[PDB]
Ligand binder design. Structure first.
Ligand code: MTE
Ligand code: CL
Length: 444
């Protein structure tokens, strides 16, 4: 027909409320996207009562990734913020660091002055209120995000550190940011020989050389962790990744679970996964389960009667698919102080090349050989405020800004209430494969 956009991103969220997996191609099934062994919201974290655990309860779920390399599933939860939380700790009252300097939060230096008045003046300036030397964890995490971003910006402006940083893989980049956070750019830039070895990928030699430094002697247990990260390119010294086979043994228990009030089964993924998730979240005992295709699916028509009786989902909130356009996202962002990415809204298909909110009027789409049918708008909640990089829920933006201008028409206030609309729910009319780059055609 007529092209109305192009597929820009495809996202599968294998575990409900956890990190998305970007893909260049995906099968469109009646239940949602599939890439190999990963299917959209086919895994679920449950509590001891069998009830879902979502990012409304545990926003740090968004830090967990489940990925698949053909033969093996990997669970991982680490990134620079988590690495530095482990190494820097958390203190909500002004304290003195090991050099005697007034500090607060996650290693946030307030001043080198011996004056407590100066430390408290810096604190109140940085937080924007009269804290009397005490902050909340949310405030400590805000300062932390600022400090990490500043460390990275600084590395990228440093002619000695940028070439090494650019040369490093993602995990080893975190180890370099870690050192800069601890000791500052100039200190790290002084590690001339180790930095050369790192840029040359001489990992064992770099590790041997880094352990001879004053840094190692002053903080040997932290340095040992950072050095292991440089040596191996893994998270072995922090929350170590868990490697699992794709096939869960049928001797594992099947649990009766509850997702948004309705029952659905899942196969327990085993004690290793339960322990790993629970330890990372520091939570009550949780399990991971997986939906198997002989189990009874949940029925979107029971949730919202605009969906067809035949529609089926596993653990998704309501719909097999969520579609969003770049234009819609850019329009929201022009109204926000803190910019957001598509990840906050957890769409499966992001389309470029259209005007704002064009998807709201795309009733029937053809993408590749796949036909999709629009059902209703996606109404948003606090999950959009959960930050994908830090796992910290703002509980405010961007949901407030969306509340300001994206409420549903008065003619439509039975379905959505006052939850703002952002993105569109679609169902499958014809199975097939879609690819990033595919033109999107409006039918009819
Ligand atoms: N396929 C699909 N994507 C979706 C939805 C859905 O129902 N189906 N709900 C959206 C909304 S309103 C929420 S808050 C989050 C929930 O993501 P989760 O089910 O992984 O926790 O998915 C978003 N993307
Ligand atoms: Cl130490």
């Amino acid at each position: 027909m007529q092209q109305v956009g192009t597929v820009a991103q495809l996202w599968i969220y294998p575990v409900k409320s956890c990190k998305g997996v970007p893909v260049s191609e995906a099968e469109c099934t009646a239940m949602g996207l599939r890439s190999g062994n990963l299917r959209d919201r086919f895994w679920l974290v449950i509590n001891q009562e069998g009830n879902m655990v979502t990012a409304r309860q545990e926003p740090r779920l968004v830090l967990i990734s489940l990925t698949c390399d053909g033969d093996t599933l990997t669970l991982s939860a680490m990134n620079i913020f988590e690495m530095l939380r482990i190494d820097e700790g958390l203190r909500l009252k002004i304290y003195k660091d090991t050099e005697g300097y007034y500090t607060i939060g996650i290693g946030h230096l307030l001043t080198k002055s011996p004056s407590l008045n100066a430390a408290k003046s810096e604190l109140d300036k940085a937080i924007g209120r009269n804290c009397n030397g005490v902050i909340t964890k949310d405030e400590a995490e805000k300062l932390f995000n600022q400090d990490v971003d500043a460390a990275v910006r600084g590395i990228l402006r440093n002619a000695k550190l940028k070439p090494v940083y650019d040369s490093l893989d993602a995990v080893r980049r975190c180890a370099l940011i870690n050192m800069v956070f601890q000791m500052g750019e100039t200190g790290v830039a002084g590690f001339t020989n180790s930095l050369r070895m790192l840029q040359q990928k001489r990992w064992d030699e770099a590790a041997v050389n880094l352990a001879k430094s004053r840094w190692y002697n002053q903080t040997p247990n932290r340095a040992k962790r950072v050095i292991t990260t440089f040596r191996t390119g893994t998270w072995d010294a922090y929350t170590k990744d868990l490697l699992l086979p794709i096939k869960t043994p049928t001797t594992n228990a099947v649990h009766k679970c509850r997702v948004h009030g309705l029952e659905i089964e899942g196969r327990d993924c085993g004690e290793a996964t339960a322990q790993w998730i629970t330890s990372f979240l520091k939570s009550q005992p949780y399990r991971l389960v997986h939906f198997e295709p002989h189990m009874r699916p949940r029925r979107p028509h029971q949730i919202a009667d605009l969906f067809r009786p035949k529609d089926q989902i596993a653990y998704s909130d309501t719909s097999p698919f969520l579609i969003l356009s770049e234009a819609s996202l850019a329009d929201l962002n022009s109204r926000l102080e803190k910019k957001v990415k598509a990840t906050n809204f957890r769409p499966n298909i992001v389309i470029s090349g259209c005007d704002v909110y064009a998807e709201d009027s795309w009733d029937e789409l053809l993408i590749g050989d796949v036909e999709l049918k629009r059902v209703m708008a996606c109404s948003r909640c606090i999950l959009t405020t959960v930050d994908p990089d830090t796992g910290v829920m703002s509980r405010k933006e961007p949901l407030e800004t969306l509340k300001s201008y994206r409420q549903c028409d008065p003619s439509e206030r039975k379905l959505y209430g006052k939850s703002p609309l952002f993105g569109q729910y679609f169902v499958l009319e014809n199975p097939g494969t879609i690819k990033v780059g595919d033109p999107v055609y409006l039918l009819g």
